Amino acid sequence: KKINNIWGAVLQEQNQDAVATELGILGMEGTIDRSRQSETYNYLLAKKLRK
Amino acid sequence: GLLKALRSDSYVELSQYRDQHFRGDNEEQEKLLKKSCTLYVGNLSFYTTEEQIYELFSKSGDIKKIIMGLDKMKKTACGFCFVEYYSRADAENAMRYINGTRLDDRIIRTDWDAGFKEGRQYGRGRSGGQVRDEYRQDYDAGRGGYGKLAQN
Amino acid sequence: NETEDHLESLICKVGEKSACSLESNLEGLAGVLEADLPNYKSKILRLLCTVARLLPEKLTIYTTLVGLLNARNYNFGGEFVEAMIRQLKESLKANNYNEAVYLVRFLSDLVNCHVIAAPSMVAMFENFVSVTQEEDVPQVRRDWYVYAFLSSLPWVGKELYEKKDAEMDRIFANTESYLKRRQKTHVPMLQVWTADKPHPQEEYLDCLWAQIQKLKKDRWQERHILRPYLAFDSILCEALQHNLPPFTPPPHTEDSVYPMPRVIFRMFDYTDDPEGPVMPGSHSVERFVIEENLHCIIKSHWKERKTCAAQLVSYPGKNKIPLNYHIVEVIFAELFQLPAPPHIDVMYTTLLIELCKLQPGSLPQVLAQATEMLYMRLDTMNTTCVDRFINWFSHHLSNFQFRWSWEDWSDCLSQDPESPKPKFVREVLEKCMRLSYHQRILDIVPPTFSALCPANPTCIYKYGDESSNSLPGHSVALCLAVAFKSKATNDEIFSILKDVPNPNSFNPLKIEVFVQTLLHLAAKSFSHSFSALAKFHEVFKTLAESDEGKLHVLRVMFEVWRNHPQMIAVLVDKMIRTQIVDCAAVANWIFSSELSRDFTRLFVWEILHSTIRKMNKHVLKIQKELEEAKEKLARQHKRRSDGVLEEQIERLQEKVESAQSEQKNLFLVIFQRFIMILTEHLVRCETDGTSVLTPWYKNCIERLQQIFLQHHQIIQQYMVTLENLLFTAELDPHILAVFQQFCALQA
Amino acid sequence: SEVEETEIFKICLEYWNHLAAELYRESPFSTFDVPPRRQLYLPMLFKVRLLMVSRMAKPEEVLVVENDQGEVVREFMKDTDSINLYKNMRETLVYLTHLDYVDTERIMTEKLHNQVNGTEWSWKNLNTLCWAIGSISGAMHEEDEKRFLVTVIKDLLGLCEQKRGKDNKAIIASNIMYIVGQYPRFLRAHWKFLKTVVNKLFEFMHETHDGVQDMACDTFIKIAQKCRRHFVQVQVGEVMPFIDEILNNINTIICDLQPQQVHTFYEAVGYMIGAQTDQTVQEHLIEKYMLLPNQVWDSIIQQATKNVDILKDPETVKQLGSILKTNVRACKAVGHPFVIQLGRIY
Ligand SMILES: *O[C@H]1[C@@H](O)[C@H](n2cnc3c(N)ncnc32)O[C@@H]1COP(=O)(O)OP(=O)(O)OP(=O)(O)OC[C@H]1O[C@@H](n2c[n+](C)c3c(=O)[nH]c(N)nc32)[C@H](O)[C@@H]1O
């Protein structure tokens, strides 16, 4: 009996996308809070730029 | 007696976000949040219609009102909305099971809302959208593109 | 009281995965409890009773603990047994029968830990099975007592049989005799599938009896249950046992509510996982124990999806099992459970997504196999379960980029469109489009499936084309469109409508033109339609002030938005909420000849159930307001130790009566229309010599069954009216069977 | 093999390479019945794999050399003793991985776990583990490689998040960039990951922490060379090819880079440009690509025409040297189609 891996492949792609998103917010200056989950954005860098 | 472990409800706990434009102290805002029936929904694609939000959030109960977030200047959808239920139980169910799932292939975030007021559906960023949109430096096709502060 | 919280945390911590072995942690906890016993004795007893009641999944972990304590303190063991008996009495008095079965199981296990003498347990079970000899009591009572006796056997059966063989044989003979004469009317109503192959959906007591018989044949030997107390066999052999006081089951009172009967959900067998551990058979006690423990784990952590998934994956067993298959089957058993799932439906979708995320290697493939198996067994699936399947599958696809192997279902293309498989495919595609746009759904499926894709959700206007010049009211329709575009108020709309020619206090053409124009001009979004309805509330109330007016308003609204079922649903809901129509009008419209072609579609029944839910919520809110007012009046009277308050209470009471009357009338109308249409179909089929069983008949009868199942608690109040007026003996047996099954559900 | 001596380890590694090559030649397939010799040697092949992963040599040698004129230049040694050592170790580990990839993946995962939990945490150990991870690029199938690399990158990002201090974050980020730059097939498969990596490199190019800018430029040129064809075409979800986006913001990307890093960046962009098959679009890209150097070139030429004495001004000479170095790097990266730029200044 064959194995249906369509959702497994989709989940692997989603995991890759999540890792890419995590890499996007990678930094080397300070820690960024993850309290907003998928809405997280670099607000410290934004504050630095605004000044 | 009851068991503390079985009482865990971490998914419906107050988040760290407090509306800075709320006309009241932190205690009053927390009191309103604890008994609120409204949820702020964020991280929506700019092409997410109110019908899709209705379909997704009616799985948790009967929806009273949906207020789509809009550009302050352009008056166009800017990736967030408010969903008000008739009962707190439906809002709790949405926070438990709709939070962190996919709408238009995007992980949407739900938060407790102290209550909708006129003008709260407009982004508070300088460009008229959400503050995160102007403060983000990545590229997002579903949210316009690069951040308004970067703009390529 | 930080000491009490620390003790509770210590007691609840045991059993969770830790560096130390289970035996070492259990011994240490027992020693600590003994050390602190003299002070916090009552707190410890209460905590142990609470965990026995609320954590069935860790049953053997805690009984053993008690045994260890019983080894160090005979008095503590006796007091704990007394407290447990008292708690069981309270639970039975409060109609909490699930907690009662958990406590009974705990006592049965305690027998194994040498805390309770076997003869006392045998006497208690003799009383339990003697409850089946009573007279003029409902079958649900006897069923629950037999179930409480049998479901504890997996744990204490070997001890009871090796100690008291003759008594156990007598009890088994009594149980078998009772089961042989049980009524099985409720089975067809509660069966997810009516096909005997490949897995019969068996009654829960019959399945339990078969499993217990198999266990008896295998020398009362089972190879799944975890039994930590064996590691302390030396310690527990020197412990002195206690005797349970003679237990008298509470008599059957009028205000006694018993659990409803169940049917076991079965879809998997060992051949579905040939490579992994051999799956326990359907008639094996291991399957029963695994399913019970998984259900209990879901029950304990339903609020927290991540914790629930972690507990499910880390479920410990004595021997390796195909855990993923068991978890999937348990989740789908809960989702498809009739009458209703234990928890909200979306919780199961989210939990399955979490499980797939936690075990990406294997769980998604098992889920795809289960989905294919469910699809292949849709011919006999129950319509309620088919709807739950459609909703879960569409929501799941929405979370996985709408990716599916549609080609595997190509057979659905060659079948009659009304068949369960093409109908399921169409409904799934419609629900997927509801979560996306039309073009995406058109793209994801193969071109050969294009015929099954949803139609474009575009409005239909009667006064848009040039050829409509001859249609009545065309000029008035144009004037109304101009007035709406110019922000005309209610008076202007009334003046414009006054020119509509009346064919004969109810003008069908006037309502038609007004509704068509207003809906067409607000067809941009749901919010625009709601604003339009709110702004012209006065016009709607004035025009559709009669029953015929409401029916025509609904007819015209359907005609405008025929291609957008979601719009129809939201509009009907809003109209009911703002009082444009009433639940009776919607119920009559559902069965009207205009919706005959869309009768079997999901959105019709979604609208009907939403209306019923709104009526129920209104009644509940009114009753709650009356109760609050009465409590406030009583408190004020007590504090003082009024005429306006009494008048307000009287007005609220008559409002409650009116709401109850409206709810009863709604249910009566629904049942009347169901009976009428079913009788018409049956008479036509008999006259033409056609088979009664057709897709339409299946859908209609199962929708009547769903109406009975969803609101059985409310419909119980109308038993006399339903029996005397609607569901009489003269009715055709096909229709009367549904009512008989509903009655047997709790009789 | 555990002795900390280069020559003794070289002898031992010569034997290990011979053994791995012989076993691979016997049967290159992974874990049919196991080959006889492989069956004999199975009990210790995992020990050899652990030795290879635990003592991986530095992949490249970088030397700071003063030129004839006094220019300080970073140069990569081509074929030295240490590079040969790394090549032999990489070949041995690749043979062993081809024998079975599950064991190599398990060893790497265990090393990464021990790095994360702090038991075996150190910059040297992390560098060695990342060199070992990079060395086996292409030794496993695309799907297994994708899964393993996703797991490794997730764990490394978590480690970077958990670790505190600028130095530790810089080390972990450099290791992540090195690993991703060693797996061009992974970046080619996923466009979002490639774009995120490139944007992260551009962000690092503004980082003044020592060594970060050089690492970013090296990784950028490596990715540009290996994935050149993915910067000129239009990618799904994009409006214009990434080359146009880079060229538009080239001024803001290199504002903090040093002249040598600027030359490296220009060479990488030229590698990207040279992949454009269309002649007209390629010419337009080349014209838009040399605009910033050409502005300074034209200004200097006009100043010289007005007064040749400006050519005796040292600053003008430094600017001319920088412009010509940029042109040389661009010519090397682009090739024949660079003629137009040359024709413009010849
Ligand atoms: O300095 C700003 C921002 O950078 C900073 N910030 C951002 N992220 C953090 C974290 N993680 N920790 C501490 N500080 C952080 O806070 C300042 C404001 O940013 P932000 O709160 O993101 O913007 P704001 O919410 O004020 O504006 P906008 O989103 O445009 O408001 C539009 C509309 O939406 C409501 N709303 C937004 N968000 C994110 C909400 C939320 O999380 N919960 C609720 N209930 N409502 C939210 C706004 O209040 C408006 O109603």
Numbering used by the authors:
A (entry chain P): 112 to 162
B (entry chain D): 4 to 155
C (entry chain C): 25 to 528, 538 to 674, 685 to 790
D (entry chain A): 358 to 388, 400 to 714
Which lines from the publication concern this structure?
A key element of this complex is PHAX, which connects the CBC-bound transcript with the nuclear export factor CRM1 (XPO1), itself bound to the small GTPase Ran and GTP (RanGTP). Additional control of this process involves the nuclear phosphorylation by casein kinase 2 (CK2) of multiple serines in the phosphorylation site cluster 2 (ST2) of PHAX, which is essential for stable complex formation and export.
Here, we describe the structure containing the short capped RNA, which was obtained at an overall resolution of 2.8 Å, limited by slight flexibility between the CRM1–RanGTP and CBC–PHAX moieties. The two lobes are connected by PHAX. The W118-containing PHAX helix is extended to include the PHAX NES, which binds to CRM1, thus rigidly bridging the RNA-binding CBC to the export factor. The downstream segment of PHAX (residues 140–162) is also structured, forming contacts with both CBP20 and the RNA cap structure. Only the cap structure of the RNA is well-defined, indicating flexibility of the rest of the RNA molecule. While V130, L134, L137 and M139 bind CRM1 in a canonical way, the first residue of the PHAX NES sequence (Φ0) is a conserved glutamine (Q127) rather than a hydrophobic residue. CBC and CRM1 also directly interact via several hydrogen bonds between Y142 and Y149 of CBP20 and K563, G605 and E613 of HEAT repeats 12 and 13 of CRM1. However, we found that conserved E150 of PHAX inserts into the cap-binding site, forming hydrogen bonds with R112 and Y43 of CBP20.
